[PDB]
Amino acid sequence: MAQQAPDREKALELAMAQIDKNFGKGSVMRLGEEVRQPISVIPTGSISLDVALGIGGLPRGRVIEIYGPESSGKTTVALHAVANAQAAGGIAAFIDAEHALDPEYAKKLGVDTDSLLVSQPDTGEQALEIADMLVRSGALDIIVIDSVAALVPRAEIEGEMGDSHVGLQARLMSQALRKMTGALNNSGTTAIFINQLREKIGVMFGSPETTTGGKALKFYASVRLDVRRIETLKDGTDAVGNRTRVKVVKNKVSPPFKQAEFDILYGQGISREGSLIDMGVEHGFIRKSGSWFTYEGEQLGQGKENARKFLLENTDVANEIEKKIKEKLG
Numbered sequence: 001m002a003q004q005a006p007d008r009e010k011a012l013e014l015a016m017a018q019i020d021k022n023f024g025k026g027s028v029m030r031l032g033e034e035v036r037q038p039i040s041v042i043p044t045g046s047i048s049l050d051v052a053l054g055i056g057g058l059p060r061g062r063v064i065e066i067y068g069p070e071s072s073g074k075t076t077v078a079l080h081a082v083a084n085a086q087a088a089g090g091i092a093a094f095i096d097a098e099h100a101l102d103p104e105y106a107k108k109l110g111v112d113t114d115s116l117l118v119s120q121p122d123t124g125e126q127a128l129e130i131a132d133m134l135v136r137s138g139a140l141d142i143i144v145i146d147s148v149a150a151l152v153p154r155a156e157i158e159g160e161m162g163d164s165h166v167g168l169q170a171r172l173m174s175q176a177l178r179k180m181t182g183a184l185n186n187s188g189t190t191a192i193f194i195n196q197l198r199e200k201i202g203v204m205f206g207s208p209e210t211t212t213g214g215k216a217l218k219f220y221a222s223v224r225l226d227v228r229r230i231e232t233l234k235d236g237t238d239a240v241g242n243r244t245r246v247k248v249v250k251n252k253v254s255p256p257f258k259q260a261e262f263d264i265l266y267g268q269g270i271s272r273e274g275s276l277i278d279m280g281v282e283h284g285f286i287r288k289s290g291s292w293f294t295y296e297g298e299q300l301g302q303g304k305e306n307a308r309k310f311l312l313e314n315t316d317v318a319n320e321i322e323k324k325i326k327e328k329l330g
């Protein structure tokens with residue numbers, strides 16, 4: 001009228017709404033928001049991690065990337081990811097390109113191997129196809145491709161080509177990805193890609209940042225987990241496991257930048273127990289000091305691991321805590 005107008009807020013969310021309607025949901029966010037609870041999500045075995053994913057676990061219907069150095073967790077997470085959506089009626093396909101999977105490990109974590117679909121492609125091209133048409137059938141829910149890096153095209157090798165044009169791999173990805181993101185979730189079949197290595201504070205190396213097939217996946221991924229090993233879980237003797245830190249650096253399904261930790265015991269998986277003590281204390285329900293963890297009056301033991309076994313063998317109480325923790329969160 002000759003007036004500018006609405007209180008920032010009343011005009012911000014007026015446009016901020018416009019945005020969503022034009023580019024989607026996760027398009028704009030206030031890191032603080034609790035924002036929605038879509039009734040879909042694969043638990044990640046770590047109450048720790050999935051209360052950080054903002055939706056109780058990996059969002060069914062989304063390409064999920066889990067990069068991170070070697071021997072730090074990704075797949076152990078992945079496998080668990082499978083175990084669950086599998087142990088809930090789901091069928092998980094696994095496109096192996098690393099040729100390094102130990103079923104009895106996947107077994108100990110609760111994966112039904114015999115009913116697990118494995119595939120060992122020959123070209124990084126074929127792989128994306130058998131996994132593209134394997135996901136179009138809508139039978140699989142969770143499909144995990146091992147190594148966004150070991151996906152070398154027919155013209156071969158990863159980091160070699162030439163003349164009047166150049167770049168291989170990152171294209172096949174670009175390709176597969178578009179063509180796969182579509183279908184991928186009309187079916188609601190969430191996908192997971194293990195990617196990996198070169199850091200713990202900054203990406204430097206040969207042909208540095210971003211990566212091998214990166215870019216595309218780095219843009220299609222609706223979630224990205226930076227899984228890096230932090231410390232070697234001592235066990236009095238040498239060591240029971242490793243503690244893992246996860247920095248969900250990209251979350252299109254809620255707020256990003258959060259993070260969780262948890263342990264992985266050498267052959268046994270992500271410790272549900274240890275994970276309840278941690279959560280259990282960082283939210284009160286479990287009291288400390290004296291190095292004696294105590295669940296409201298009743299004690300658990302003297303020293304993480306001891307209270308850890310207590311919870312291991314005492315499921316009754318354990319469930320309670322997982323519980324109390326559950327609604328104290330979401």
Ligand SMILES: Nc1ncnc2c1ncn2[C@H]1C[C@H](O)[C@@H](COP(=O)(O)OP(=O)(O)OP(=O)(O)O)O1
Pocket residue numbers: 068069070071072073074075076077102105196241242264265266267268
């Ligand atoms: N078959 C196994 N038996 C016992 N422990 C295992 C086994 N496989 C892996 N681990 C343990 C040892 C390591 O400290 C830890 C690493 O987990 P892992 O799932 O192998 O990480 P990752 O698969 O994400 O990383 P990488 O990139 O090296 O493949 O788990």
